[PDB]
Amino acid sequence: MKAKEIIEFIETFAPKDLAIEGDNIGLQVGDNLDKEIKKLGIALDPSLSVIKKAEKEGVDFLFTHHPLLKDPIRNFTGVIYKKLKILMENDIILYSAHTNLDICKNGLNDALAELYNLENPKPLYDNGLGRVGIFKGSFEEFLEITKKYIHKNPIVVKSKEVDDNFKLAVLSGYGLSQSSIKYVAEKADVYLSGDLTHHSKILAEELGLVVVDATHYSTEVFGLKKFKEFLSSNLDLEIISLDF
Amino acid sequence: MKAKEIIEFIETFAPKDLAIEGDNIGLQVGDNLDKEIKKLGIALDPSLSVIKKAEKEGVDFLFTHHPLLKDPIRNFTGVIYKKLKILMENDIILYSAHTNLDICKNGLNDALAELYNLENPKPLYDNGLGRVGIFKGSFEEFLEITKKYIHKNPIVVKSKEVDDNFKLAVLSGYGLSQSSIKYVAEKADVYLSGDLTHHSKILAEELGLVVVDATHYSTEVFGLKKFKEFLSSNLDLEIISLDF
Amino acid sequence: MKAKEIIEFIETFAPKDLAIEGDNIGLQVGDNLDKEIKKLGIALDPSLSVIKKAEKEGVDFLFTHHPLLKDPIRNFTGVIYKKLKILMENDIILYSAHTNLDICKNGLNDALAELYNLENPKPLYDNGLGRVGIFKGSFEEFLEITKKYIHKNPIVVKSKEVDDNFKLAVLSGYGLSQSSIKYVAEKADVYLSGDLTHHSKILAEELGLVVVDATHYSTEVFGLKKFKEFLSSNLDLEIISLDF
Amino acid sequence: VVNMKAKEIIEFIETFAPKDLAIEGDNIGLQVGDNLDKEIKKLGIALDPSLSVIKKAEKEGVDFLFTHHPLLKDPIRNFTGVIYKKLKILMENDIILYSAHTNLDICKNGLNDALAELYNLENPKPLYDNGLGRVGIFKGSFEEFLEITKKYIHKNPIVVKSKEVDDNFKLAVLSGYGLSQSSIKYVAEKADVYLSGDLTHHSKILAEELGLVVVDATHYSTEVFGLKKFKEFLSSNLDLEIISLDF
Amino acid sequence: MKAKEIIEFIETFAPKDLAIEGDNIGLQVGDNLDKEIKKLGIALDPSLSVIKKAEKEGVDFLFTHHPLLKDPIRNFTGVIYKKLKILMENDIILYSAHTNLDICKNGLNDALAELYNLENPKPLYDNGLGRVGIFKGSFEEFLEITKKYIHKNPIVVKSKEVDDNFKLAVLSGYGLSQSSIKYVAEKADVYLSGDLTHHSKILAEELGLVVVDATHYSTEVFGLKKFKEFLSSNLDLEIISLDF
Amino acid sequence: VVNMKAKEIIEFIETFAPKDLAIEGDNIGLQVGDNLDKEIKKLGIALDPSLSVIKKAEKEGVDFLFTHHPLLKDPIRNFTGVIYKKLKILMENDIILYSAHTNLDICKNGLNDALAELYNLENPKPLYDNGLGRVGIFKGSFEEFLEITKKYIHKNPIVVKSKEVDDNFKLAVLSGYGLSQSSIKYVAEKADVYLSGDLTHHSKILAEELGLVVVDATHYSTEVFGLKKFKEFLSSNLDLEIISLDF
Ligand SMILES: [Cl-]
Ligand SMILES: [Cl-]
Ligand SMILES: [Cl-]
Ligand SMILES: [Cl-]
Ligand SMILES: [Cl-]
Ligand SMILES: [Cl-]
Ligand SMILES: [Fe+3]
Ligand SMILES: [Fe+3]
Ligand SMILES: [Fe+3]
Ligand SMILES: [Fe+3]
Ligand SMILES: [Fe+3]
Ligand SMILES: [Fe+3]
Ligand SMILES: [Fe+3]
Ligand SMILES: [Fe+3]
Ligand SMILES: [Fe+3]
Ligand SMILES: [Fe+3]
Ligand SMILES: [Fe+3]
Ligand SMILES: [Fe+3]
C-alpha cells in the first residue's frame, strides 16, 4: 500500500476536521507519500525509545496518537535532533491522529463508552470530547470493569456515596484538569479519566464529584488497541504496536 | 496576640517580596487586623473541609500555604459561597504565604534540602524556587530516606542508572511540569518533586532525568510541619493543623 | 414561592441571551435557589446602604439592575467584605438583570420610548441598546415631558435649533460617552440619556447634536418602577424598592 | 509689543512645563503645523481645540493656537466631518496648533499647583506617582473650603457628602477629570475630601460607600482657574499679544 | 456631476464589501459630497507630487488606488501636513478603491487574467485576490506578452523549466511576499506579480516556482488604465491620469 | 593545516561577534546539530542556508556550515517539503549548521563596519540604537560615492534621486534589508543618502516625498561584501579549508 492510501484510510475513520482548534494532527514528518508501505507501527507517543524501536523493527510508517511537537521550534538539537535523524535517515513517515481520534465515532472516547455500556451516550463537551451517560449498575460493578479491562489499580477519589444507575462521564487521556473537574461536576456523578493532580483532587472532593484516575496511558491504550485491530482486519499490511 | 502581629511575624520569616510575581499572597479574606486571635490554624489548602474544621475547632486565624483564589472572580456561588460564608460569619481571618514560604531561608524547599543533607545547596531557579546540590550516598539510600520521611510509595521514573554522589534537585509541590523537566535535566541527575503526569514521565525518560514523585501534598507538608513547630515555639498562641 | 421561580419569571421577561458581551448578569451572590422568598427587594444599585437596608427590612431576595462587580477580584477586604458578610449571614440572594433588562421588550429603553410615544421606534444600536424614532411635537413639548416624568432639571446642551417632529434617541443610563455622541449624531437630532462629561459636551456641540442629560439614575429608575409594578401585579409576593 | 518666532514660544512653554513630565502616551507638543520659524503676531489660549475655538482663532487673527487638551487622543486615517473642518481652518490660515496637556498639570505652578495654592494646602504632596494632583491639609472648616470653591472655581458645585468632615482635614485636588471609579478608590485612602471634575453615577455611589467626600466643581472650571494664571504668566513675560478663546 | 454620484458609480463597479479586512478604502479626505465635479484625476498613489499635480491641473475629485494612510496618526506635520493642506485649501476630494478594485469582476486582477487569456481563471486566494488558470502557449510567449504590455524588462527567477500550457498565477501589486510564494508554489508553475525581494527569490528557487517581477507599479497600472477608459466612456466628465 | 572541533570554531566566531549583540528575537547560534565535539576539516560559509547551498555543502564534504541568515525565523512543528529535504541532508551527513545574523551586522569590523570603512565615513556612528547600520559624512561628491558603490558592491544599483546631493553629505549604510517604509522615515531625518537593499514600490514613493536619496545595491551584495571580509578573516586565523557556497 502507498502511504497516502494509509493516510486516507485513517482520515476516513477519523476526519481531520473533528480535531479541536490548534491541534497538530496529520503529517508530522515525511516527504514522498507515494512511497509503498510494508510495515506500519502504531504507538501512543512519538517518544525517543518508540522511534528507536521503529527503526529496529523496520517500520516504514509510524502512526502515533500524540503529535511529535505541540510547541513549534526553530532549532534542532538534543532529543528532537535525535528523533528527526532516525526518522529521516530511514525515511520513516510519522503521522498523527490526536483529538480527531478521541472524538470520532468508535474512537477512543466511544470505546470507553462502549466498554461501560453507557445508556444513551452523549458527548461530554461541545467540541466532541468525552462521553457521558447512565451506567446501568452499581459503583462496585463499575470498579470491577475498570480494574479488569482498563487498569488494575485505579486511584479513586470517593467524594460522595454513589447510587446505582448513576451518570458516568469518561474522557480518555488528560481530562482531570481543574477546569474539567468544575465542568463535569455539573454533568455527572462519576468521572473516569487520567492524570490526576493535587489541586484537582481537592477540587473534586469539594464539588462532590467522584473521580477515578485509571491513568492517561491506560484510558487511551484501550481504544488504541481496538483501532490497531481495526487496521489489521482491513489493511493487507503487517501492523505492530511499539509502546503497548 | 493581634492578627497584625501574627502576620508581621510570618512576613519576617517569609518576606512578601520573595514571592514570585503574580502570586496571590497575604490577606485573602479579612476585616479588622486589630482583632485579637484565639487559635491559629495552619493548613496546606483553604479547602471547604478545612474551613469547616476551622469553624468547628474555633480557629479565628486561618493560615494556608495555597491562596484561596488564583483566578479572580465576580460571582459568589457554589463552593466559594460556602467558604466565604463560614469565614465571614465567624470573622475568621484567612492569610496565605505561598511561594514566599517556598523560597525563604528554612522554607519549604530548604527543609527538603536539609533532609537530604545536600552538599553546597543552591537555588534551582533564578527566582529562587527549589534547591540543588550533591547527595552524598547511593540512590537506594536516597529512596529509603524519601520513603521514611516523605511518602511511602513514591512513583519512580528510572530513566537511567544513577551513580553514587549524584546531583539531586528538590522542589516542594508541583515541579514536574514539562518545562521544569527540560530545565532540571540540564542541572541534576535526580529530580524530587510532586504531581507527575504522563507527558512529563515520557519527557524525563527521553532526557535521562530520574524523577521521583513523592506527591505535591507530602513534599510541602514536610516543611509545613517544621514551620508549625517554629510558630508554636515562638508565639503565645494555641496552634493546630487542619489538613495534616 | 421559590427563588428559582422568581428568577424564571425575570428571565422570561428579560432573557439572559439579550445581554451584551461580557455583561455580568444573573446570580451575583447565592447558593440555594430552592429557598423560599417572603420579601423581594428591588434596587438600582447593590450599594452598601442598599444591602444594609435590605437586611433591615428583612429582604431575602435582592434584585438589582447593576451587577455587584464589573472587575473580578481574588481578595476579600474592605467594602466588598462588608457587602458579602451582610448578604451571606442573612442568606440574602443577590440577583441582577442588567443590559438584558435595558434591551428586552417593555424594558428600560422601551419604557422611555413609550413615554415620549416615539413613532416607529427602532433599536438605537445593533446589539439592542437604546431606541430611536420620531417625536411628534416640538422640542419644548419634549422638555416638559422630561421635566414632569423623568427629571425636574435636566442639563440641556442646545447645539442647534430643533424643528418639530424631530428624531429622538433615548438610552437609559450611561449613554453619553464620546463614542456614543459621535454615533448618535448620525442618527438623531436629540439624544436623551445620562452621565454627561466635559469632552462629551464639547463633541455634541461640534456635531450639532442636542444632548439632554436627565441623569443616569433617573433614566433607569423610570423603567425600573414600571418593572416593579409588573412584578407586584403578577407575583404573590411582598415587593419593596430600596434606592427609589 | 513685538512678533516672536513660533519656536521661541514653544521653547518658553517647554521651559515652564517640560515635555518629559507628561504621562505615558499623552499626545503633547505640536498638533498641527509645519514651519516653526513662522513669525507670530497673536497667541491664543484655549482649554479645548474645539471647532468653535478654532473658528474664533481664525476670526481674531490668531497665528499660534495653544490648547491644554490635544486635538486627538485616538489616531485616525480618514479626514472627514469635524476633523476636516478644523484642519481646513488651521491649514488655510497657517495657524500653528500646539498643546501642553499633563505636563502642564504636573509642573511647578501648573494647573494642580494652582489649586493647591488657592486652598493654601499645608505640606502639599503629589497625589499620584506620575505627579498628577496635590494633597495636603486644609487649615480650616469644610464650610470655609466650600466658600473658596464657590467664589473662585464654581458657584454651584456638586457635593457628595459621604461623611462629616472635621476642621483641618486632608484635601486632594485634581484639575480636570479625576472622578473615575479607580481614582475614587485610590484617593479614598489618602484624603477626607476630593476636589475635581466630571462626576458620574457609579463614582458617586462608590464615594458614598468609602466615606470619601467628593466635590465636583466641573472639569472646565478646575482647569480654567490654572489656565488663567498660565495666561497671565505668558502675558507678563512675552512681548506678544495674547488672548483667551473659550475662557 | 456631484461627487456622491461618482462615488456611487465606482462602488457599483467595485463594491466596498469586496475589500479585504482592515483595508482603508472609501473617502480619504473630504466633507461635502454634494460638491460639483468638473475634472476627475486618477492616480496609483496619493503621493506628494501627484497631489501637487492635481492642484495644478484643477482636479476636483482625486481617485487613487492606494489609500492616503495605512497607519493612523494623531499629529499633522511634514508631508501629511503638506498633502492635506493642498487638498483642503483647493477643495479637492480624495477617494480610494484599493483591494475592492483588485478583486471585483473586470478589476485589476481580471485585467491581467484577460491579457494572458487564462483558461478557466479562478481566484488565487479565498478572499478573492489574484487569478490563476492555464496559459495556452509556451513560457516564451507568456514572457513576450509581458514585455510588450506590462514591463519591458521584468526580473525572471527561472527556478525550473516551464512546459507549454502551464498554470499561471497573477497578482497585481505586492504579491511576492514569502507567505505568498509558499502558497502559490502549490497552485501554479509561474507567478506574475511585483515587489520581489531577496528572501522571496531564494524561497521561489527552493520551491521551483518561477517568479516574474513586472514591478508593483506596472502590474497595477495596466488595469488602472482600463478602468480609466471605463470611467471616460461612461461619465460625462473630464478625466486625466496623474502618475501614469 | 589541521582539524578543529566544532565548539572551537563557534568559540572563535563568538569572540568576533558576541551573541549578546544580536537584536531581540534574533535566532542566532546553533541551528542544526547535536555533538559539538565533532571534528571539522572543512568549513563552509554562506549567506543563506538555502536548499541549493545545503546540497552543495554535502557535495563538497563540508562538515561545518556557517550562514549569515538563520535556517528558520518562524518556528515550525511539522517537517515536510523543503525543510524536510534540508534537514535530511544535514542529518545524514552530520553537518553542523551555525548562524551569526545581526550580531555579525553590529559587531566591530562586521558587515555594517565593512561598508562604513569602504566609504571612509568621517565620524561614523550607529544608525539605530540597537545598533544596526552606520551613519557619517562622506568626504566627496555623490558621483564619487556612486562609483565606489559600482566598483565594490554592485554595478547596477537602483537610484532613487529624490533631490540634488551636495558634496560632504551625510551617508547612512545598512547591510541587507534596510529599505522598509519605517526605516526610510527614520533615516530621512538622519542622512541625505541611504545605501541598503531590497527596495519596494511604497518605499520608493516615500523616499521621493521625504527628499531622501535611496540607493539599492541589493540585499545580496551589501551583505556579501562584508561576508567576504569575514571569510578571509577566518582563513588567516583558522587552519581549516574554508570555502564559500553562494558567493
Ligand atoms: Cl493529551
Ligand atoms: Cl503550587
Ligand atoms: Cl450602565
Ligand atoms: Cl483630561
Ligand atoms: Cl498593495
Ligand atoms: Cl535580514
Ligand atoms: Fe493523550
Ligand atoms: Fe487522546
Ligand atoms: Fe503547592
Ligand atoms: Fe509550594
Ligand atoms: Fe446603569
Ligand atoms: Fe443600564
Ligand atoms: Fe482636561
Ligand atoms: Fe488637565
Ligand atoms: Fe498596490
Ligand atoms: Fe492592488
Ligand atoms: Fe540579510
Ligand atoms: Fe544582515
Rounded to whole angstroms, the Cα distance separating C66 from C51 reads 13
Q: What is the 3-state secondary structure (H, E, C) of E192-237?
A: EEECCCHHHHHHHHHHCCEEEECCHHHHHHHHHHHHHHHHHHHCCC
SS3 A132: strand
Looking at the DSSP assignment, which residues form a beta bridge with residue E63?
Answer: E42, E95
Q: In the structure, how many helices (H) and strands (E) does chain E have?
A: 9, 11
C-beta of residue F247 within 8 angstroms of C-beta of residue F199 = no
C-beta of residue B102 within 8 angstroms of C-beta of residue B43 = no
Looking at the DSSP assignment, which residues form a beta bridge with residue F135?
Answer: F125, F172
Rounded to whole angstroms, the Cα distance separating C229 from C235 reads 10
Instruction: Tell me how close the Cα of A232 comes to any Cα of chain F, in angstroms.
Output: 28
C-beta of residue D191 within 8 angstroms of C-beta of residue D143 = no
Rounded to whole angstroms, the Cα distance separating F58 from F80 reads 20
Rounded to whole angstroms, the Cα distance separating E61 from B52 reads 77
Which grid coordinates are listed for E8? 456611487
| Together in a domain, A148 and A105 | yes
Say which of C69, C76, C89 has its CB closest to residue B29: C76
Q: Do C198 and D201 touch (CB under 8 A)?
A: no
- Which helix or strand (DSSP H or E) is residue A155 part of? strand A155-157
Rounded to whole angstroms, the Cα distance separating F126 from F173 reads 10
Q: Do A77 and F27 touch (CB under 8 A)?
A: no
Question: What residues contact residue C18 under an 8 Å CB cut-off, 6+ apart?
Answer: C99, C100, C103, C104, C128
Amino acid type, D16: F
Report DSSP state, residue B239.
E
For residue A190, report the distance from its CA to the centre of ligand 9, in Å.
Answer: 26
| Together in a domain, F231 and F193 | no
C-beta of residue A178 within 8 angstroms of C-beta of residue B45 = no
Q: At residue C221, what are phi and psi to the nearest 5 degrees?
A: -65, -35
The terminus-to-terminus CA distance of chain D in angstroms comes to 23
Which grid coordinates are listed for C93? 440572594
C-beta of residue F146 within 8 angstroms of C-beta of residue F213 = no
Q: Which burial class, exposed, middle or buried, applies to E226 when counting CB atoms under 10 A from its CB (0-12, 13-18, 19+)?
A: middle
**Angle between helical axes of A48-56 and A78-89 (0-180°, round to 10):** 20
| Together in a domain, B162 and B229 | no
- Which helix or strand (DSSP H or E) is residue E84 part of? helix E78-89
| Together in a domain, C107 and C72 | no
Closest CA relative to residue A148, chosen from A122, A115, A117: A115
- E78: cis peptide before it, omega within 30°? no
Pairing assessment for the beta strands D193-197 and D169-177 based on DSSP bridges: parallel
> Which residue of E68, E71, E75, E93 is the best one to mutate when testing the D interface, meaning the one whose CB has the most D CBs within 10 A?
E75
Closest CA relative to residue B76, chosen from C133, C69, D5, F142: C69
Q: Do E31 and D80 touch (CB under 8 A)?
A: yes
Residues making up chain B, counted from first to last: 244
Q: At residue D222, what are phi and psi to the nearest 5 degrees?
A: -70, -20
How many other β-carbons are positioned within 10 Å of the β-carbon of residue B34? 9
C-beta of residue D6 within 8 angstroms of C-beta of residue D36 = yes
Amino acid type, F189: E
Long-range contacts from B10-14, C-beta under 8 angstroms, 24+ separation: B10/B63, B10/B95, B10/B97, B11/B97, B13/B104, B13/B106, B13/B227, B13/B230, B14/B97, B14/B100, B14/B101, B14/B103, B14/B104, B14/B107
Q: At residue C213, what are phi and psi to the nearest 5 degrees?
A: -95, 100
C-beta of residue E40 within 8 angstroms of C-beta of residue E9 = no
Rounded to whole angstroms, the Cα distance separating C73 from C85 reads 16
Looking at the DSSP assignment, which residues form a beta bridge with residue C74?
Answer: none
Touching subunits for chain D (3+ Cβ pairs under 8 A): C, E
Closest CA relative to residue F173, chosen from F222, F209, F218: F222
Q: At residue F188, what are phi and psi to the nearest 5 degrees?
A: -55, -25
Q: To the nearest 10°, the Cα dihedral for E203, E208, E209, E212?
A: 80
Pairing assessment for the beta strands A93-96 and A61-64 based on DSSP bridges: parallel
Q: In what order do the strands lie in the sheet with A167-174?
A: A119-123, A131-134, A167-174, A190-194, A210-213, A155-157
Looking at the DSSP assignment, which residues form a beta bridge with residue A211?
Answer: A157, A191
Rounded to whole angstroms, the Cα distance separating E198 from F68 reads 13
For residue B93, report the distance from its CA to the centre of ligand 10, in Å.
Answer: 21
Which grid coordinates are listed for A69? 511537537
C-beta of residue E62 within 8 angstroms of C-beta of residue E31 = no
The residue behind cell 487574467 is E113
Rounded to whole angstroms, the Cα distance separating F43 from D167 reads 84
C-beta of residue D141 within 8 angstroms of C-beta of residue D104 = no
Q: Do B195 and A194 touch (CB under 8 A)?
A: no
Q: At residue A159, what are phi and psi to the nearest 5 degrees?
A: -70, -25
| Together in a domain, C103 and C211 | yes
Using alpha carbons only, what angle is made at residue B168 by residues B162 and B172, rounded to the nearest 5 degrees? 135
Report DSSP state, residue D150.
I
Task: Please give the distance of CA E138 from its chain centroid, rounded to a whole number.
Answer: 26
| Together in a domain, C172 and C222 | no
| Together in a domain, A93 and A172 | no
Q: What is the 3-state secondary structure (H, E, C) of D159-187?
A: EECCCCCCCCEEEEEEEEECCCHHHHHHH
Amino acid type, D28: I
SS3 A203: helix
- For the residues of C85-116, what is the DSSP string, one character each? HHHHHTT-EEEE--HHHHHSTTSHHHHHHHHT
Interface of E with F (CB under 8 A): 45, 47-49, 66, 79, 173-174, 194-195, 197-199, 202, 205-207, 215-217
Rounded to whole angstroms, the Cα distance separating E151 from C3 reads 78
How many other β-carbons are positioned within 10 Å of the β-carbon of residue F60? 12
How many other β-carbons are positioned within 10 Å of the β-carbon of residue D59? 10
Q: In what order do the strands lie in the sheet with E155-157?
A: E119-123, E131-134, E167-174, E190-194, E210-213, E155-157
Say which of B28, B70, B77 has its CB closest to residue C31: B77
SS3 C180: helix
Which grid coordinates are listed for D166? 472635621
Which grid coordinates are listed for C219? 433614566
Rounded to whole angstroms, the Cα distance separating B191 from B184 reads 7
Closest CA relative to residue A4, chosen from A38, A42, A37: A37
| Together in a domain, F65 and F129 | no
Question: What residues contact residue F194 under an 8 Å CB cut-off, 6+ apart?
Answer: F172, F174, F178, F179, F184, F187, F188, F207, F212, F213, F214, F215
C-beta of residue F153 within 8 angstroms of C-beta of residue F221 = yes
Q: Which burial class, exposed, middle or buried, applies to A231 when counting CB atoms under 10 A from its CB (0-12, 13-18, 19+)?
A: middle
| Together in a domain, C226 and C197 | no
Torsion sign (Cα): D14, D17, D18, D19: negative
Closest CA relative to residue F4, chosen from F184, F226, F241, F224: F241
- Which helix or strand (DSSP H or E) is residue D84 part of? helix D81-92
Rounded to whole angstroms, the Cα distance separating C242 from C82 reads 18
- Cα distances from A19 to residues A15, A42, C198, F70, F86, in angstroms, run 8, 19, 52, 32, 30
DSSP helix, strand, coil percent of chain E (3-state; round to 5): 40, 20, 40
- Which helix or strand (DSSP H or E) is residue C141 part of? helix C139-149
| Together in a domain, B133 and B87 | no
SS3 A19: coil
Closest CA relative to residue A223, chosen from A129, A123, A127, A106: A106
Beta strands in chain B (DSSP E): 26-29, 39-43, 61-64, 93-96, 119-123, 131-134, 155-157, 167-174, 190-194, 210-213, 238-241
Task: Please give the distance of CA D23 from its chain centroid, rounded to a whole number.
Answer: 14
- For the residues of F27-60, what is the DSSP string, one character each? --EEEE-S-TT-EESEEEEES---HHHHHHHHHT
C-beta of residue F77 within 8 angstroms of C-beta of residue A84 = no
Task: Please give the distance of CA E227 from its chain centroid, rounded to a whole number.
Answer: 11
Q: Which residues of D touch E81 (CB under 8 A)?
A: 32-34, 91
The CATH number of the domain where A106 resides is what? Answer: 3.40.1390.30
Which domain does E3 fall in, by range? 1-98+216-240
Locate the chain C residue with the closest alpha carbon to B87.
C85
| Residues in the 5 Å CB sphere of ion ligand 2 | B 173-174
Task: Please give the distance of CA C235 from its chain centroid, rounded to a whole number.
Answer: 21
| Together in a domain, C15 and C72 | yes
C-beta of residue B220 within 8 angstroms of C-beta of residue B115 = no
**Angle between helical axes of A216-234 and A108-115 (0-180°, round to 10):** 100
Q: Do C81 and B28 touch (CB under 8 A)?
A: no
Residues making up chain E, counted from first to last: 244
Task: Please give the distance of CA B240 from its chain centroid, rounded to a whole number.
Answer: 17
Half-sphere exposure (Cβ direction) of E220: Cα atoms closer than 13 Å: 25
SS3 C201: helix
SS3 A73: strand
Which grid coordinates are listed for E139? 513560457
Half-sphere exposure (Cβ direction) of D186: Cα atoms closer than 13 Å: 15
Touching subunits for chain C (3+ Cβ pairs under 8 A): B, D
Interface of E with D (CB under 8 A): 24, 26-31, 67-78, 81-82, 84-85, 88-89
> Which residue of B25, B76, B82 is the best one to mutate when testing the C interface, meaning the one whose CB has the most C CBs within 10 A?
B76
**Angle between helical axes of B78-89 and A198-207 (0-180°, round to 10):** 80
Rounded to whole angstroms, the Cα distance separating B56 from C120 reads 64
Using alpha carbons only, what angle is made at residue D90 by residues D89 and D92, rounded to the nearest 5 degrees? 65
| Together in a domain, C206 and C110 | yes
The domain tally of chain B equals 2
Report DSSP state, residue B135.
-
- For the residues of C124-140, what is the DSSP string, one character each? SSTTS--EEEE--S-HH
| Residues in the 5 Å CB sphere of ion ligand 11 | C 173
Rounded to whole angstroms, the Cα distance separating B55 from B47 reads 12
Rounded to whole angstroms, the Cα distance separating A121 from A106 reads 12
| Residues in the 5 Å CB sphere of ion ligand 6 | F 176-177
